Structure formats: C-alpha cells, structure tokens
Design an enzyme around this catalytic site. Structure first.
Site, PDB file in Angstrom:
ATOM      1  N   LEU A   1      48.740  35.726  33.777  1.00 10.04           N
ATOM      2  CA  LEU A   1      48.897  36.268  35.118  1.00 10.04           C
ATOM      3  C   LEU A   1      47.725  37.187  35.447  1.00 10.04           C
ATOM      4  O   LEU A   1      47.156  37.847  34.575  1.00 10.04           O
ATOM      5  CB  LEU A   1      50.224  37.011  35.261  1.00 10.04           C
ATOM      6  N   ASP A   2      47.363  37.218  36.725  1.00  3.99           N
ATOM      7  CA  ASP A   2      46.073  37.742  37.149  1.00  3.99           C
ATOM      8  C   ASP A   2      46.072  39.264  37.233  1.00  3.99           C
ATOM      9  O   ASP A   2      47.006  39.953  36.818  1.00  3.99           O
ATOM     10  CB  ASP A   2      45.683  37.139  38.492  1.00  3.99           C
TER      11      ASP A   2
END
Lengths: 42, 87, 89, 128, 176
Positions: free
Chosen positions: B41-42
């Site tokens: 996840l960013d």
C-alpha cells in the site's frame, strides 16, 4: 609568531562549594563562618 | 489523571488498530513487517495510518519524523520515546 | 558547466514532442520512438523545475536615434491575448 | 480561487505561496547546501562544547556577545549627522517638548485668568 | 529546513499539504462520519490526477492546491494538547529539573537516598570512562572537514556507547 603576553588564562572558577558543604557564602575558614552568621543574625 | 502505559500493551494497541483498518490483510501482518515494501500500500494511505495513530494516542507526530516509521515496531519505538514508556 | 546544467535542466522527456509528417505509419513511428527515445530522461536533478510565471506588459517607448540611415523603422504594439481564448480568432 | 493574500509589515507571507519556492535555480540549491553546511558546523562545535564533562561555566556564546556590543555601544561609531539623522532628531526631541510647553502654558493661563476673575469654585479647595 | 536533508522534496511537500488539509477538515467537520465522507472526497480529488508525471504540471497543480487550501482553511485548527500552541505545550516544564544538577545537595540529604546516588556515581563513571578516546576520535576521523550533515554515526567500531549521548539520553520524563 605573536603572543604579546606572558600570563596564564586566569583564574580557575572556584565555586566555594564541594569542599565545605555546610559553609555560608564567604571564605572557607569554618570557624569564622559561624562567627559571621552569628554576628549578623544576632 | 492516571494512565498506565507499558511496552507490550501498547504494542497490542498499535497492532490492533492496524488490524482493524480494512485494506491490509490480517494474515501476513507481523510485528516487524514493512508498510510499503511488502504490504504494497502506497504513501498516502500510510500517512492516513499515521493520522490514525495520532488520533488515537493524543499527540501529533511531526512531518520530520513522519517519513520513517514504515513498520509497527519502529512506531512503537517512537511512541515509547514520546511518552517515555519504560519502568 | 552552465551548458551542462542547461542541457540537464531543460532537454527532458515529458516536455519534448516527436512530431513527424509524410509517407510514414504511426505504427512505424511508435516502434522507432520506442526503440530509440526510450530511456532518454524524465527526472529532474534536484527537484529544480522551471515554471512560467506570468509577465507584465509594461507599456513604454524606446527610440534609438541614428540619423545615418536611409529609412526609419517603427513598431507599435499592444496587449497580449495569449493562446486559449477565441479572442485569438 | 482567492484574493492572493497581500502581505504587510505584520501579516507575514507563509512558505506556501511564495512563489519563489517554485522556480528553483542552481544557486538556490547551492545556497541551501552551504546553509546546511553552516548550521552543521555550528551544531558540531556546539555539541562538542556542550557534552564535555569537564565543562564548568556557560558555553560562552560569541554571537550573543557580538550582538550585545552591536546594540549597546557600537552605535556611536559609526555616525555622521546627516540630513535624515538631524531632522529626525530635532523632530523627536524638541517637538513633543514644545507641544507640552504650549499646552501647559494654555492651561496655566486659563487657570490664572479664572482665579483672577474671583469666581473659582474654591468652595473648599484646601489641599492645594 | 530540516536536520538531515538540506531541503524538502516535492513529494514531501505534497504530503505535508495532504496532512494539513486533512487536519483542518477534522477541525472543520464535526460528527466524524461526515468528516470521513469529506475526507474520502478529498482523497478522490487527489486520485483524479495521481498518475501523471508532468512535473511542471504537477507543481502548477500544487500552486493551485495551496491557493485552494488557503481559501477554505479553518481559523483555530484543532491542535492536540501537547502540540505547539496546544493546551499544555510543555505544561510541566515547571517540573522539569535538569540532571546536571541534583549533586549540589547536602551530604545528609545525600545520605537519605543511598542507592540512587551510588548508581548515579557509576553512571557518571560510565560517562567519564568512554568520553575522550572513542567519541572524540570518531568525531575527528570519520567526518569530513566540512561535516555537511548532522546525523552522527553510531559506535559500530568496537565497544562502548554511540557518541555524544549525555544530554539526549538524560532527558526528563515529560510527566513528573
């Protein structure tokens, strides 16, 4: 090549504590210290 | 005003509120497992995670320190530096 | 050094446009662009991005008197319309 | 979507809409690099003279001493009495003084005239 | 303006704008769930052009983002009661006595607390033990003439504590 002086970096910053831990404000002679606190506080 | 704090209790609470947030998996979520490198996840949702920890524990963490949390163990390190969480 | 910094700062991939016209195919140009221009650039050096700040049409005059010339050149100009508006049309 | 936030002498312009933090040139980043070098060397010598266990007195900060000698007694050299300096001096010194002189002469002449009339309200006015 | 880096990058700047807008929308919006709605709307607005790499169009959008942030910010942001400007903001800085002191006491009152002062004596011996050689050599060997950063390297070399630790290890409890 230039000094202009001969004296030491003076003095050692002697706090009066760490040598007479019951002392009052002035010099380290422990009898007259009691005499001074005596004479002012009476 | 008496909150008691300890190491493993706050490790439990950080790990718990990471488990409650949805778009991670609860399977491979170790105590020391990364955020960007392995979960994938960013950055933006990572800072939403940092927002969640701030909104839970009652103090902002700065943007100078917000770059470098990246896993829950380092989060517990920084919070234990904040509240001095040792005996 | 300054030419190096100019080359590195401006000749960069997202602001350059490969245009061709004539007896060629857009397949073939896409193929040749992928074979050659790929891996050119795309990342600025120290995040030093140039940007158009707007400019000021001041409005003034300069005359350069030089009487040893056979003809006189005059230009007179007014405000800019830009590009986007149909005022250009 | 905003009136673009004019600054003032007090309303300081925050670091967002500078817009000088956008057209970054070479000497801008060179200046930030050398500025970090300056802050780095000063904190290095500070932390060296700050963690010494033999250290007794203060850390003996030279820049505060320098600014004290600047603001205190290095005002007068240098100084030449110019047009601006002398005019602002004769305004700020003599001006309000002569103003208060005129208002005190005004009130005292009014009071002396009113008590020379005979009708001052001295119904009892003892503690003069 | 930060310790390690000489400057903040543009991705960092976009990220700090994100955190500021999100914080002020918290402060703007009560009931917390319509807050959650508006926050995902804001995150959608950042999803609208998230996948573009025109850096000059990116900073154009960043300038307009700073304008649209300043247009609708909140007057008193909800800041936490340990933040700068907060309700406490080092409340008990009253009760934060430094630890270079406490040794200018009297030997009777020192003899009232035996074990803490014995362990403090061995702490101070730990300090003076490995102050000179390892710390000073690692700070006058491994740095350059111009240091050019501020993060100091740990004592990975052989033995004792990483350099210059006294006033950073020995800070108070922040709630005594």
């Amino acid at each position: 090549p230039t000094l202009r002086w001969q004296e030491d970096p003076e003095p050692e910053d002697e706090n009066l504590y760490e040598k007479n831990p019951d002392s009052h404000g002035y010099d380290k002679d422990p009898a007259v210290d009691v005499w001074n606190m005596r004479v002012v506080f009476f | 005003d008496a909150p008691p704090l300890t190491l493993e209790g706050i490790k439990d609470r950080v790990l718990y509120v990471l488990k409650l947030y949805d778009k991670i998996d609860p399977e491979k979520l170790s105590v020391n497992s990364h955020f960007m490198k392995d979960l994938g996840l960013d950055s933006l949702d990572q800072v939403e995670i940092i927002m969640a920890m701030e909104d839970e524990f009652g103090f902002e963490i700065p943007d100078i320190d917000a770059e470098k949390l990246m896993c829950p163990q380092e989060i517990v390190d920084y919070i234990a530096d904040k509240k001095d969480v040792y005996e | 050094a300054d030419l190096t910094e100019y080359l590195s700062r401006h000749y960069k991939a997202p602001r350059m446009v490969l245009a061709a016209a004539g007896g060629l195919e857009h397949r073939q140009l896409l193929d040749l662009a992928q074979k050659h221009f790929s891996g050119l650039s795309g990342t600025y050096d120290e995040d030093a991005v140039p940007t158009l700040t707007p400019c000021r049409f001041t409005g003034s005059e300069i005359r350069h008197r030089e009487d040893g010339l056979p003809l006189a050149h005059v230009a007179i100009a007014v405000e800019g319309p830009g590009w986007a508006n149909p005022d250009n049309v | 979507s905003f009136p673009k936030y004019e600054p003032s002498r007090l309303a300081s312009l925050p670091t967002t809409l500078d817009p000088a933090e956008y057209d970054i040139s070479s000497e801008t980043r060179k200046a930030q690099a050398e500025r970090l070098a300056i802050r780095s060397r000063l904190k290095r010598e500070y932390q060296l003279q700050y963690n010494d266990p033999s250290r007794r007195g203060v850390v003996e900060d030279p820049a505060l001493i320098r600014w004290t000698c600047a603001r205190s007694a290095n005002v007068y050299p240098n100084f030449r009495p110019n047009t601006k300096t002398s005019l602002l001096g004769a305004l700020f010194g003599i001006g309000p003084l002569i103003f208060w002189y005129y208002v005190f002469k005004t009130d005292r002449d009014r009071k002396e005239k009113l008590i020379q009339e005979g009708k001052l309200d001295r119904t009892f006015n003892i503690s003069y | 303006f930060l310790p390690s880096a000489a400057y903040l990058t543009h991705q960092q700047k976009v990220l700090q704008l994100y955190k500021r807008a999100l914080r002020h929308l918290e402060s703007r919006c009560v009931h917390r769930d319509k807050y959650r709605y508006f926050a995902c709307l804001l995150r959608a607005r950042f999803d609208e052009h998230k996948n573009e790499k025109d850096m000059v169009k990116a900073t154009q959008l960043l300038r307009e983002a700073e304008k649209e942030f300043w247009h609708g910010q909140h007057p008193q942001p909800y800041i936490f009661p340990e933040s700068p400007g907060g309700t406490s903001y080092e409340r008990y800085e009253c009760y934060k006595v430094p630890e270079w002191c406490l040794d200018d006491w009297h030997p009777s009152e020192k003899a009232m607390y035996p074990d803490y002062f014995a362990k403090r004596e061995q702490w101070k011996k730990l300090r003076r033990e490995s102050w000179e050689r390892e710390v000073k050599q690692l700070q006058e060997e491994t740095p350059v003439g111009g240091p050019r950063t501020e993060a100091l390297p740990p004592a990975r070399k052989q033995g004792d504590l990483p350099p210059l630790w006294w006033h950073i290890v020995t800070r108070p409890r922040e709630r005594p």
